[PDB]
């Protein structure tokens, strides 16, 4: 329902904390690093830097996605919005 | 009508020539340069470089605009598309 | 790295408002960043004009190029004011 | 500026296909561009690792960083092949 949604926007927009649990993220980084070089170790701050940048990247993406969703007539964001945003952003997989 | 439109797309997509009349463009450049420095003169190639870059910029913009127009349900491109594109492109006036 | 100075500048602007270590981290990133940016353009300007030395005249043009509208005008003023004092203030 | 070489390379690849002056202009822009790009990163890599000299080891890492996926692998091979010939081919 609309009221809780906005209430959540308001609260999480006022927030400054990392929204993903530290551990799961760290694992994702290790489980990725292993491809490029098997004997790799990341300092905790280096991992931290990645999360700060990762979540920053994502909200920024979300904002743009939101603008696309609204561009039609919707309030609900679909994959096609993330894609249209990333497209115009020049991003690629 | 659809048939002529596509026929025009096909022809102008195959084309490589500058689509704006040289003269009007050159005037626009002079009539702008005058602000920054009154005693300014542009070589013809420098002007040419500006047009190559200007029209390039514009079709690129148009492509993106087109993707926005289509994003709703439309085929006709409106200002709100150019704006949504420029927004996600990070551009500003 | 700049913490000394940025703190010195802080008291000069808000002589009662402190700054966190983490926020100081950011300030340091900012200082190094725009330094890197300005010196990069300055260096670029010098090669273009086939000059082997980076004059203050390059720092200025670099500043005009990288900084926004009116934010650039002050930076030039401040720099000229500063450079001139130093040169005369032998 | 590179027209000599790019033409020399052209005949080597298509010994019957010519190239326009305007197209040659582009090729020259390309050569200078990626040169500027690669040397820029190479230089960046050297300062980071507090080295006063740009080794071929920097050109390589720079190449890995700037060039796409598999397009980078060849460039490294070609460069190593080339460097090695020159070094041994005294």
């Amino acid at each position: 329902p609309g009221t809780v949604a906005l209430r959540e926007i308001r609260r999480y927009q006022k927030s400054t904390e990392l929204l993903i649990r530290k551990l799961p993220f760290q694992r994702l980084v290790r489980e990725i690093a292993q491809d490029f070089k098997t004997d790799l170790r990341f300092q905790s701050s280096a991992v931290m830097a990645l999360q700060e940048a990762s979540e920053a990247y994502l909200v920024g993406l979300f904002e743009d996605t939101n603008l696309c969703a609204i561009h039609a007539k919707r309030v609900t964001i679909m994959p096609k919005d993330i894609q249209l945003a990333r497209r115009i952003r020049g991003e690629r997989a | 009508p659809g048939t002529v439109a596509l026929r025009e797309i096909r022809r102008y997509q195959k084309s490589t020539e500058l689509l704006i009349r040289k003269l009007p463009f050159q005037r626009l450049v002079r009539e702008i340069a005058q602000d920054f420095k009154t005693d300014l003169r542009f070589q013809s190639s420098a002007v040419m470089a500006l047009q190559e870059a200007s029209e390039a910029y514009l079709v690129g913009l148009f492509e993106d605009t087109n993707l926005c127009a289509i994003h709703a349900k439309r085929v006709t491109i409106m200002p709100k598309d150019i704006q949504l594109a420029r927004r996600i492109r990070g551009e500003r006036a | 790295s700049y913490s000394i100075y940025v703190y010195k500048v802080l008291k000069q602007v808000h002589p009662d408002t402190g700054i966190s270590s983490k926020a100081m981290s950011i300030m340091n990133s900012f200082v190094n960043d725009i330094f890197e940016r300005i010196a990069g353009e300055a260096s670029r300007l010098a090669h273009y004009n086939k000059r082997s030395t980076i004059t203050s005249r390059e720092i200025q043009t670099a500043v005009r190029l990288l900084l926004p509208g009116e934010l650039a005008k002050h930076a030039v003023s401040e720099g000229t004011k500063a450079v001139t004092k130093y040169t005369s203030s032998k | 500026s590179y027209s000599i070489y790019v033409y020399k390379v052209l005949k080597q690849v298509h010994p019957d296909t010519g190239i326009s002056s305007k197209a040659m202009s582009i090729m020259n822009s390309f050569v200078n561009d990626i040169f500027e790009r690669i040397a820029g990163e190479a230089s960046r890599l050297a300062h980071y690792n507090k080295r006063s000299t740009i080794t071929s080891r920097e050109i390589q890492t720079a190449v890995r960083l700037l060039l796409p996926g598999e397009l980078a692998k060849h460039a490294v091979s070609e460069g190593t092949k080339a460097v090695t010939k020159y070094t041994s081919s005294k």
């Binding site: 927009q13 | - | 100075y5 700054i19 966190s20 926020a23 300030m27 330094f35 509208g69 004011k81 203030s89 | -």
Partner: protein, 101 residues
């Protein structure tokens, strides 16, 4: 006497001078170069530090935390361009809800 004081500055003219040559930016950097650059650095520092300090007060605090730098940078239209593609660690995002909601 100090080059930083001769130029009436806080930022280290000397340090900036070292960085300019070490950096391998130039062949030889002039005398006024670091003093001009040091000057601009100090200026911008003061600028964002000012707006930041304001936002710190406006909430309720005395210590400036990243959020303030963020809120500060994003709210000044001119500073927002300069640090457009910059991410302030723990800066968070500027409160904003698209009207249509």
């Amino acid at each position: 006497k100090s080059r930083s004081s001769r130029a009436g500055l806080q930022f280290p003219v000397g340090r900036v001078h070292r960085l300019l040559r070490k950096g391998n930016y130039a062949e030889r950097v002039g005398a006024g170069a670091p003093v001009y650059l040091a000057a601009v650095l100090e200026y911008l520092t003061a600028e964002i530090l000012e707006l930041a300090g304001n936002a710190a007060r406006d909430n309720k605090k005395t210590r400036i935390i990243p959020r303030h730098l963020q809120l500060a940078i994003r709210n000044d239209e001119e500073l927002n361009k300069l640090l457009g593609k910059v991410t302030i660690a723990q800066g968070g995002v500027l409160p904003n809800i698209q009207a249509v909601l």
